[PDB]
């Protein structure tokens, strides 16, 4: 398997980082198998499947909220059973509401878990729709979920092979022209970094 030369990655100035516009910490994470990196991404397929992927997300969210309201109605039936079993026998005033408070807490934690799942799906969709090359994907679990849900439309590896592919898909002429434009037009810190 390929390896990366230590001189051009670790040093006073990071040559690999300067060439790829990557921070040295992120570069170390990439080439030391601590974070995935997106080698390349397609534009036409994402562009023309955005609508159907949004529809699929809406359908999945509708299924999750249907499960949520099923949980709500199950909790309502459980609360009715608790009311029947507590408001018909001899019990303390606090004891007849202890079960109600417990059921309310269970309902709150259920809806909290549902909200967490909704937020997770939302951020997965956001990072898919804002995907771009030279982007690190921490949370290997999140990356794996993104891959299995969206195996197409992009490719992403991690390590020396990924860095080699990134260098392969690179345009030195366009990069030089862009940096020249930046050094002409920008000011201050951006101009210094561009230089």
């Amino acid at each position: 398997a390929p390896v990366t030369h230590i001189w051009y990655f670790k040093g006073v100035p990071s040559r690999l980082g300067y060439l790829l516009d990557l921070a040295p910490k992120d570069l170390e994470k990439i080439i030391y198998f601590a974070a995935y990196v997106i080698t390349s991404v397609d534009e036409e397929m994402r562009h023309n499947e955005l609508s159907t992927l949004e529809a699929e997300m809406a359908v999945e969210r509708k299924a999750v909220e249907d499960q949520r309201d099923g949980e709500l109605e199950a909790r309502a039936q459980k609360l009715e059973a608790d009311l029947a079993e507590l408001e018909a026998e001899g019990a303390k005033a606090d004891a007849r509401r202890k079960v109600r408070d417990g059921g309310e807490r269970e309902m709150r934690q259920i809806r909290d878990r549902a909200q967490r799942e909704l937020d997770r799906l939302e951020d997965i969709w956001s990072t898919f729709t804002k995907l771009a090359p030279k982007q690190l994907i921490v949370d290997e679990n999140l990356y794996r979920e993104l891959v299995d849900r969206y195996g197409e439309y992009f490719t992403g590896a991690m390590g020396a092979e990924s860095i080699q592919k990134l260098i392969e898909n690179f345009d030195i002429d366009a990069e030089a022209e862009s940096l020249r434009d930046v050094i002409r037009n920008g000011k201050g810190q951006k101009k210094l970094r561009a230089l």
Partner: protein
């Protein structure tokens, strides 16, 4: 250093053609990378 490089490269080859989980394969690849880094410049990164 050359022995470590050769040993880790050979072990990576054996793991690859045998078929191993991504965790072990990536660990061996990192092993090879760190060994090559030590060979080229020992103590540049991490404990020498």
């Amino acid at each position: 250093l050359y022995r470590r490089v050769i040993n880790r490269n050979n072990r990576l080859k054996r793991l690859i053609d045998l078929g191993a989980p991504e965790i072990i394969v990536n660990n061996e690849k990192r092993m090879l990378q760190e060994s090559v880094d030590a060979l080229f410049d020992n103590g540049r990164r991490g404990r020498p």
